[PDB]
């Protein structure tokens, strides 16, 4: 086939989802060019698992799921099979048998704001770890102690989402990164 995959809608979306509420778009029966998806910007990364990046090109008879969201720079390592930490534990989890690619790039120029961008959040607390590709958008007060919270923030009773608050002056590990996860 010779009809272009609409990856431009994923990679070049004006705004990205918070990682805890991550987006998913299905891409099917079209052709693409991995060298167009990844442009090798200085502060960017491209990794594949169980596949060659060339397998992104011929999608004429294949379905790809494009998941996308924003994290901070020092969390990009968690967007991989086998990883631990707040993002992989509580926000976006890949299976051990993940077969696909991860593209992440610094978006300080789009997603920071002099006073703080509070539109991007991540889940800081959860009673247990997500399963692969699970998605949780609940905002129930997290009970960190023995006293039950009754929907009221308080001592040992935490609102579960933390805002990144991205500011363009943040250090290298704290700046925002857009992420596209391509899975087969």
């Amino acid at each position, epitope marked *: 086939c010779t009809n272009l995959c609409p990856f431009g809608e994923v990679f070049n979306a004006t705004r990205f989802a918070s990682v805890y509420a991550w987006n998913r778009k299905r891409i099917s029966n079209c052709v693409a060019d991995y060298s167009v998806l990844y442009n*090798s910007a*200085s*502060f960017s*990364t*491209f990794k*594949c*698992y*169980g596949v060659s990046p060339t397998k992104l090109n011929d999608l004429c008879f294949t379905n790809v799921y494009a998941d996308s969201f924003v994290i901070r720079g020092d969390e*990009v*390592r968690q967007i991989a099979p086998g990883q631990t930490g707040k993002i992989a534990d509580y926000n976006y989890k890949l299976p051990d048998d993940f077969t696909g690619c991860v593209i992440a790039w610094n978006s300080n120029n789009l997603d920071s704001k002099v006073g703080g961008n509070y539109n991007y959040l991540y889940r800081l607390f959860r009673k247990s770890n997500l399963k692969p590709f699970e998605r949780d958008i609940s905002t129930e007060i997290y009970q960190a102690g023995s006293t039950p919270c009754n929907g009221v923030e308080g001592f040992n009773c935490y609102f579960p989402l933390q805002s990144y608050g991205f500011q363009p002056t943040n250090g290298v590990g704290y700046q925002p990164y857009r992420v596209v996860v391509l899975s087969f």
Partner: nanobody, 132 residues
Framework: QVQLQESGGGSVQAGGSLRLSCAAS????????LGWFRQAPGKEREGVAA???????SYADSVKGRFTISRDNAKNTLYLQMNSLKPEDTAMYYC??????????????????????????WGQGTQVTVSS
């Protein structure tokens, strides 16, 4: 997680040479992205050189023309060859790696590969001391 066992540091006079090596675990080594970092006392860690799974290499400006990063995929070994050493090359040097048992391709841009953001595994560090 990748085990990194590192070796070869030492003392040498200015203008001399020294070679670091790093032995890595795993069965997907040729897919790894690999880097060398260094940290002198009372100054923060700095990316020195990187090589991605395709074999493209990147160098900090201060070592271009003197240091060479290379890899031997058949032996799971990473090297840093250091020539024309200067006193300000004195530092503790670390190999870093991004691996994983299903990792099949691994790269990034210049700034990313020379930062710690790329790597989830670090070697134990070896000392290089350049006497004037």
């Amino acid at each position: 997680q990748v085990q990194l066992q590192e070796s070869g540091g030492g003392s040498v006079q200015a203008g001399g040479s020294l070679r670091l090596s790093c032995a890595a675990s795993g069965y997907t080594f040729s897919s790894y992205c690999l880097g060398w970092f260094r940290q002198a006392p009372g100054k923060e860690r700095e990316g020195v050189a990187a090589i991605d799974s395709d074999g493209s290499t990147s160098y900090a400006d201060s070592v271009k023309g003197r240091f060479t990063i290379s890899r031997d995929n058949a032996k799971n070994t990473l090297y840093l060859q250091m020539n024309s050493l200067k006193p300000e090359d004195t530092a503790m040097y670390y190999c870093a790696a991004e691996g994983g048992p299903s990792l099949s391709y691994c790269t990034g841009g210049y700034g990313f590969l020379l930062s710690g953001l790329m790597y989830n595994s670090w070697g134990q560090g070896t000392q290089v001391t350049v006497s004037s």
